[model samples]
Target chain A: RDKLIIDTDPGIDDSMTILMAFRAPSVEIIGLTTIFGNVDTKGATRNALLLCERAGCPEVPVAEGSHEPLKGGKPRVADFVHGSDGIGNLFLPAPSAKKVEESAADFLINKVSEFPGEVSVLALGPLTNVALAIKRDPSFASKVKKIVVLGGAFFAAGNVNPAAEANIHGDPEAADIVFTSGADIVVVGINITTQVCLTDEDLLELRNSKGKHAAFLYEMCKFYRDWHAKSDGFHGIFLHDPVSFTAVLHPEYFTFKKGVVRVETQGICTGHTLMDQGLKKWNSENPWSGYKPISVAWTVDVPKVISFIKKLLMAP
Target chain B: RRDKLIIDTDPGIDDSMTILMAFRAPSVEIIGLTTIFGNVDTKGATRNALLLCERAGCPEVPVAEGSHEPLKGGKPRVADFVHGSDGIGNLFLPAPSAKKVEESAADFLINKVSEFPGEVSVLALGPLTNVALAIKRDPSFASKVKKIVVLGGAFFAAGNVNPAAEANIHGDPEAADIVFTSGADIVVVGINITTQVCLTDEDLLELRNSKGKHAAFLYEMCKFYRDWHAKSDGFHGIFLHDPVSFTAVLHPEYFTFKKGVVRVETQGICTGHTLMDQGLKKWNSENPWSGYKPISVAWTVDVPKVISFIKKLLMAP
Candidate 1:
């Protein structure tokens, strides 16, 4: 089994994302790290364990991830899109046991340090926690196999503004530090997810399906679907955060190009993933140029992607 | 009798030019002549005019003297640098059999136009002193004469030497002043038209092969002119300035023109600068034309026809 650490803020979309990774037979999700984004890290940590226990993968240790960004800034929470509970206000109750007493940064450092070249840090939120770990233990970057992130856009500029994406803008300085930390990084940008939309009809089909796991995923997808419609006017909810997690479980489902990306620090107009196309001469001067090339999602086969998600949901 | 013409010139090698060209051109009836201080001085310019007329077999044409100094007092300037001291290169030939008619150029010009009302065309090649004096003497003569086709001014029409300079303008601003405002219908051909009609080394060779008195004159003038141009301005050959002016008068179809307002500067650093105003908008309400209505600003030329005319007229040596 492929050993993995799932980092997330556990929005309704993230709930389904965690469930999908747990169901994958080849994936051994070694840890669950929750950061403050969709909901607070306290809520996300409780939800991560609840979902893991519900999916019969309760052995996966849950670690409390960073509550704030690395640049000593206030936490940015998207209550409009993710709702007050972070999981569409549809609380999944709680697990029988409390999370292990360890910081997400320490958990990431210890696991990768223990496993050496075998661990993959899967990030599904602002890279605040992972960035904190890399800064605390510099060797954390080399110890991990690859850090696959679900933030930024490739050709697409931003979801918030035309030039920025949510995760990058949430804590840009930390995102910049994470990108330049010499890790084998892959960014499953919004280019892949925004194009692969889950319509109302698609959701209706999944919701009507007779299965406990299907019902749980259906509820999680609905919260995200409603939030996306109300907040960002997404035609249908794009499983943006979920797709990045799935890409790590099965790498063939996504195609990518190596690009040098950046995040904007200050501007009324800019806050998110301001990824430089990496073609211009000035992009070469970016501090992240010496870091290994980050894989940016350029294309996604839609039919294969739908089947990949459905197969994981139906798994015993 | 096509039309009577008075060629007022400073008989440089090129002054011999207008004399020779107009003598050959059947349409140009050479009536009177005027000399200025150009090729050598007033005496040399007059002598060369008399010599050219005798050689061309038109000794019957009258020649006279005009301004010795510029209308304003300045050092006597002539392009002997190009024309040599005696005018026609350094080619000192036997003196002309004919003598100059005794009359001042200004008096002769007024007398001729008064004789032939609205018939005489003033082909002024040198400083416009004689023509200006004529205009000054009788302002009515401006209406009496057909037109004054002068070889001066730097318009878009090709300039003779530099973008700003032309030989006629270089000679006298006071003369340029009288003609520009003389109220006579004018067609000004400057360096622009002349530079295009070049006499090449090969053409001089052809003239040399056609051995006659006219051919020898052509050969000597061309070689001397070429040497002068090369030494002075770094040009390879002589630009046929006088012949082009004559061609414009005789064959108006050989040239293209546009009407423009031309003014000559009389003072300051840019004295003798011919400023032409190209009117952008057509005047419907008030009459737009101010000085010399509808002046032909010559731009293009018929080169082959000009060469053939030069050959037949001069009987090219």
Candidate 2:
């Protein structure tokens, strides 16, 4: 199994995403690094542990990271859009256990340094913890095989502001650091994810699948679907976080493009994810131009992916 | 004397706000209502004007529909993003009984300005159509108007469409060019001015007080209008752009004047513009043509003055 680390904030959608990571046959979840994003870091850690237990993968360690941002700022919660509680207030009871003693940044550094160039980091939350790890150890960049980030928007308009995706916009300074750190990056932007919507039919199959975990997965997705329906008017939740999880397990499902991304930290209108297009034009002489060279997800076969996810849920 | 005024309009929700404000302003003997392509089509704008007049008990206001498009070829597409399909926040008002002045807005404006001479205060809330055409018609039309007040251009903030152009300048640079070149006494009611004179929650309450003609119609329209503007533009308070234009015309003292050459920045990666010079250290014009007119560039209304004026005009009597 491929060694992988899932960095997440455990939103209801995130809960489903983490379970998929645990169940995927081709990948081994090394550890879960919890950060504050969709929910507080405390809540995310609890949700991550709960999800691991439910998936019968409780042995996998969980480490709690900063509740706030790395650059000394309070966590900007999505109270307005994501409801007061993340996960649409499904109020999934907290997990019985707590995260490990070491902080997420430390856990990340130890994992990558201990196993050089063999670890792929699936970054579903803000890039704060990863950026912190990189800052602590300069060699952290070379140690990680690749980092897949589910953030940023190019042609598609952002959900948060007109110009930014949520994860990148939440802590752009951290995103800036990670992107410019010379690591192999795969950025799954909203432009593609928005099109990969899970229809009502996809949910029905999971419900019909009748496994112990299948029903639970279906219920979790049902709650997410309802919440997304009310708030964003989405036909179904895009399962944005899971795309990163699947990219690691099922590489055949996605197609990629080499592109350049720029994070705008300063303006009122554009606080994050202001990714510029055109890779060839900028990469030549402007090495220190600070734009992140990323393997971008241009498209995905949504029907197959949804079916695959359903099959994973149906599996014992 | 007729309250000589020219309306440059887009007929957005706030443009409707302005049309209502002008109708209620007793001092406003509205000589002509000139429609431009802003929120809706010029045709929709003309329809909106007629609707507002019919509702406000003034269908007699000579409504002349202007250009169907900008001076350039892009037909005026209503910003359903800001204003809904009906153009005024999705609220449909009844069509006015009065017929439009059979002539095109450009011809109507040329005739009106020449007839009234230097007494007409032109209120351009939308794109500059008739004003630009008038400049081409009677080269001296700009010099004749009392003042051409434009509700477009952004200086302190970035342009709405791009880094370079605001909606009006972006809509029609050629028309903006003609009007900017015309020797009209120009007062620029840009984003800087309108953004300040906003409608607070308290203002909304007052406007919606007794469910009368203006009050009832406005309150309903404002509900959707408020949500649309706030959601789309991140506007905290509704800016009464057209009303503010009327405020400038009736009470100039409420506004502060600045004089400098204002140039419309066209032709770049981003289109549309209204660039103004703050410092007057250099002189480019042999005559005063290049110099900025005594423009009411900024305003903070004496609320008491405006309230008293609005109260008397909108009273049951």
Q: Pick the candidate with the highest TM-score.
A: 2
Q: Per-prediction fnat values?
A: 0.00, 0.00
Tens digits of lDDT, candidate 1, A1-316: 8899988888777877788887777888899998887777787888888887887878879999877877666675777667788877675566796788999999999999988999998888888889889899998888899999988754343555443467776777778778777788888888678777678877776777654588777776666776666645654578786678767876787777775555546542234343334432221132334445567777888887877876666554
Evaluated on chain A only, model 1 obtains a TM-score of 0.91
Candidate 1 regions with alpha-carbon error over 4 angstroms: A232-235, A274-291, B1-317
Candidate 2: interface RMSD in Å? Answer: 18.5
Q: Give the docking tier of candidate 1.
A: incorrect
Which residue runs of candidate 2 sit more than 4 Å off their true CA positions?
Answer: A79-85, A279-292, B1-317
Looking at model 2 chain A, report the run of 10 residues with the lowest lDDT sum.
A279-288
Report the lDDT tens digits of candidate 2 across residue range A1-316: 7889888887766777777677677887899999988878887788788888887778889999988876677787765444455665567667776678999999999999889999999998889999999999988988999898888875444556444578987788898788878888888887777776676777776677765576766666666676566646665677788766667667679898765555656543333343333421221233224455677787888877777766665766
Q: Return the lDDT, model 1, position A243.
A: 78
